Design a binder for this molecule. Structure first.
Ligand SMILES: COc1ccc(S(=O)(=O)N(Cc2ccc3c(c2)OCO3)[C@H](Cc2cccs2)C(=O)NO)cc1
Ligand SMILES: [Zn+2]
Ligand SMILES: [Zn+2]
Length: 201
């Protein structure tokens, strides 16, 4: 679900950042690990902010919606970390939003790939599952990525742990593909990010 908006691509892949106070050294290490992970697989770079108008601010706040997707023009944007959403994989995901990705399951073509089980969604949270409008996403010729760091789990925003809100429609290597990994950038995330930022081969 890569943004179609050219203004939302960070020029030259350069993303200035500020780490807010109140973070422990341990937490700051995770932020650096997450940023270096992006840097090591793509041409995106993170720079300590000096006088740039647009930059990201690691902010210590309760977990939940919402992040700005891509570069916000004319002011900073928060990347929010809380007690229960501070691990490497979650920060990598949030940096996915920063660079310009919406949630994978909201791709305009997602109905070919997953079913949404509406009756299992937490009332009021259905907006989490609405497709991006077709003009808001340019997938850059890349197929739907079940392994994406940006993909929800099977039971995200569900009425219960054992009730699925998202069910892949078909088998890959004999089984329905697992979704919602928060280990690392997928092969798909990297290929697509490289296209989005026009990274040198
Ligand atoms: C429409 O935009 C948003 C943006 C952010 C959020 S969120 O609540 O902050 N959250 C949803 C989430 C929780 C658990 C998950 C999941 C997605 O996938 C695997 O398991 C995550 C961050 C969090 C992790 C744990 C608690 S909150 C997210 O998508 N951030 O971008 C919700 C909606
Ligand atoms: Zn997210
Ligand atoms: Zn993708």
């Amino acid at each position: 679900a890569a943004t179609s908006r050219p203004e939302r691509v960070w020029p030259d892949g350069v993303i200035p950042f500020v780490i807010g106070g109140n973070f422990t050294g341990s937490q700051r290490a995770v932020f650096r690990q997450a940023m270096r992970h992006w840097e090591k697989h793509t041409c995106v770079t993170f720079l300590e902010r000096t006088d740039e108008d647009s930059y990201i601010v690691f902010t210590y706040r309760p977990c939940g919606c919402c992040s700005y997707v891509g570069r916000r023009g004319g002011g900073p944007q928060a990347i929010s970390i809380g007690k229960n959403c501070d691990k490497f994989g979650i920060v990598v995901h949030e940096l996915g939003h920063v660079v310009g990705f919406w949630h994978e399951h909201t791709r305009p073509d997602r109905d070919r790939h997953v079913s949404i089980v509406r009756e299992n969604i937490q009332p009021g949270q259905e907006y989490n599952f609405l497709k991006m409008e077709p003009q808001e996403v340019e997938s850059l010729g890349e197929t739907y990525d079940f392994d994406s760091i940006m993909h929800y789990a099977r039971n995200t925003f569900s009425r219960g742990i054992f009730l699925d809100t998202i069910v892949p429609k078909y088998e890959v290597n004999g089984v329905k593909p697992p979704i919602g990994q928060r280990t690392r950038l997928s092969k798909g995330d990297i290929a697509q990010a490289r296209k989005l930022y026009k990274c040198p081969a």
